[PDB]
């Protein structure tokens, strides 16, 4: 199906404790493959998936240069935005940048993204046309004007439509054994009496890849969406994910409830009943 490549940058100021910290991570779909941490001893972009380790030293030097230059840029921007919002020198603040591209099943460019936050809130974003910008507030309007004048959008589009996609295709081929795998969820049910007249039914999905999944409970065929407890999909730590959904059932009525599991890895959606 379709695939995405995404880079995530976080810069955090720490006044009177030296330089901002800068962390970069890169993902293909739900799999992380590189990181950089300005505080770590290496001062290098590092591998975090097996398939990226085949890149040679020129790759790693350039990637390292890229992220180090972004960290310096963010460093200055942290001062500028503090000024735009009239903030003291004393507080910690955060600039976050997410960018990337999506390709279809055939490998063709579907779309590109670049979006920036300040203190966890939208600041500025490249619109889907990749030629224009949306500013969240008056500070970001100042940035927008500078970026319009500097023709920022043209530089970013060229990356998103070119290198971004080309490299995503490379990685999908070189990591095909893991990136292009589906691991279907392994499912089961648990059941716990709460009293003599209520019981929890919990429906489990384990070991699945990619993260996207749907777990639903029905009673007699009727969706019990409003009475279902879901947890956020969570990492197992081995590259697969886990999720569960639970309903409190009047005791003795369990056979009326069915759990439904949809995932890309299943030839057909699974139904479970206690």
């Amino acid at each position: 199906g379709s695939h995405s490549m995404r880079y995530f940058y976080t810069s955090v100021s720490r006044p009177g404790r030296g330089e901002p910290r800068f962390i970069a991570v890169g993902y293909v779909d739900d799999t992380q493959f590189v990181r950089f941490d300005s505080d770590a001893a290496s001062q290098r972009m590092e591998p975090r998936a097996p398939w990226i380790e085949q890149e040679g030293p020129e790759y790693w030097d350039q990637e390292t240069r890229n992220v180090k230059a972004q960290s310096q840029t963010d460093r200055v921007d942290l001062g500028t935005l503090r000024g735009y919002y009239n903030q003291s020198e004393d507080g910690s603040h955060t600039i976050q940048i997410m960018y990337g591209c999506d390709v279809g099943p055939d490998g063709r460019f579907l779309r590109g993204y670049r979006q920036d936050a300040y203190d966890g809130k939208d600041y500025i974003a490249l619109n889907e046309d990749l030629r224009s910008w949306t500013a969240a507030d008056m500070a970001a309007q100042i940035t927008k004007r500078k970026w319009e004048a500097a023709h920022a959008a043209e530089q970013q589009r060229a990356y998103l439509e070119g290198r971004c996609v080309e490299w995503l295709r490379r990685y999908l081929e070189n990591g095909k054994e893991t990136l292009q795998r589906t691991d279907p969820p392994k499912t089961h049910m648990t059941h716990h009496p709460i009293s003599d007249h209520e019981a929890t039914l919990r429906c489990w999905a384990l070991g699945f890849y990619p993260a996207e999944i749907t777990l639903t409970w029905q009673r007699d065929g009727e969706d019990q969406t409003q009475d279902t407890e879901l947890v956020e999909t969570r990492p197992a730590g081995d590259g697969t994910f886990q999720k569960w959904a639970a309903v409190v059932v009047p005791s003795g009525e369990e056979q009326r409830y069915t759990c439904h599991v949809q995932h890309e890895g299943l030839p057909k959606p699974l139904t479970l009943r206690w």
Binding site: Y7, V34, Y59, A69, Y99, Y159, R163, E166, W167
Partner: peptide, 6 residues
């Protein structure tokens, strides 16, 4: 591959 000119 990360962007250089961003």
């Amino acid at each position: 591959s990360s962007c250089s000119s961003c």
